[PDB]
Design a protein around this ligand. Structure first.
Ligand SMILES: CC(C)[C@@H](NC(=O)[C@H](CS)NC(=O)CCC[C@H](N)C(=O)O)C(=O)O
Length: 331
């Protein structure tokens, strides 16, 4: 009949990953392994982050920022004066054509003092921020959130490492405040009446979409969304609906994880169904350092041997973000 099934997205209590009960951490790791080998998604619960404040502060920002402020913060794709802003800054909507808009920021430790900024290494940028007096407390909240979700992500990486049979720091040792290329994106999906057809895509299977299929450019992705169902994950039997949960974090592996595990943990393909509803999508992309290299392995093989070439994370990220724009469009 062409009906759509619902993806199995287990809720995993990740709180043992913050503690020192090693057996309890292994039991979390088993659940991460099972989810990563199934649909590729799970909900992290008991994460310790105040996601209500995150949603409230984000909404206040989205709903009070003016067109003048958006131009002032706009990335190079919308403002030719800002050639240094390839990643960080505001991503404008286009009424009548493009509904989505967002604000992306990077490691707050990227300053003019940082040697990667001094060296002008690709993918490193100094964050841009609105005026404090026009957006009181926003930058402080946003930077605090970066480190809040950094801490959650570090614990999740311990779970992934144990799940793959490694020591718990196998990934986290490359995830550091002084060089991480991780990013936060505060995405607004608006309610619009009428909703512009030009902002709606039609999938091959006929589904109306706001964003087409993609793998995440990340090691893992740590995503908060408001309570409006929209995501679908691709399975061999077709796309399946991911149910919403505005109290937890949706977790999945990115294509760097698929590379280094020889696809043992696949990077799930997801897409965004079109829904005419005001809502939030707030991903944290767990990226490593520019020179981070994890030696690939294959958990399926007794000797764990993989002849996949080691891939520097900075090259992976630069190529990945460009390719995602080319394939799915400038967001
Ligand atoms: C939940 C996702 C599907 C979310 N989309 C996303 O996260 C989108 C599209 S895959 N992600 C990106 O474009 C990559 C952003 C990378 C960021 N600017 C950076 O420099 O690090 C959505 O809600 O659209």
């Amino acid at each position: 009949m062409g009906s759509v099934s619902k993806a199995n997205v287990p809720k995993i209590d990740v709180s043992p990953l913050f503690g020192d009960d090693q057996a309890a951490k292994m039991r979390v790791a088993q659940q991460i392994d099972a989810a990563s080998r199934d649909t590729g998604f799970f909900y992290a619960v008991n994460h310790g982050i105040n996601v209500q404040r995150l949603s409230q502060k984000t909404k206040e920002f989205h709903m009070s920022i003016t067109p003048e402020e958006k131009w002032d913060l706009a990335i190079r794709a919308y403002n030719k004066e800002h050639q240094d802003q390839v990643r960080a800054g505001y991503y404008l909507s286009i009424p009548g054509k493009k509904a989505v808009e967002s604000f992306c920021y990077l490691n707050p430790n990227f300053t003019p003092d940082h040697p990667r900024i001094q060296a002008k290494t690709p993918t490193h940028e100094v964050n841009v921020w609105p005026d404090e007096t026009k957006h009181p407390g926003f930058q402080d909240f946003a930077e605090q959130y970066y480190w809040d979700v950094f801490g959650l992500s570090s614990a999740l990486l311990k779970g992934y490492a144990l799940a793959l049979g490694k020591e718990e720091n196998f990934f986290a040792r490359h995830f550091k405040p002084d060089d991480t290329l991780a990013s936060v994106v505060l995405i607004r999906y608006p309610y619009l009446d009428p909703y512009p057809e030009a902002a709606i895509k039609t999938a091959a299977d006929g589904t109306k979409l706001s964003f087409e299929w993609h793998e995440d450019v990340s090691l893992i992705t740590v995503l908060y969304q408001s309570n409006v169902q929209n995501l679908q994950v691709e399975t061999a039997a077709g796309y399946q609906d991911i149910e919403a949960d505005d109290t937890g974090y949706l977790i999945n592996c990115g294509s760097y994880m698929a590379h280094l595990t020889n696809n043992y943990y696949k990077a799930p393909i997801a897409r965004v169904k079109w829904v005419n509803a005001e809502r939030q999508s707030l991903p944290f992309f767990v990226n490593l350092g520019y020179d981070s290299v994890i030696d690939p392995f294959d958990p399926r093989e007794p000797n764990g041997k993989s002849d996949r070439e080691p891939l520097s994370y900075g090259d992976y990220l630069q190529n990945g973000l460009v390719s995602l724009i080319n394939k799915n469009g400038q967001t």
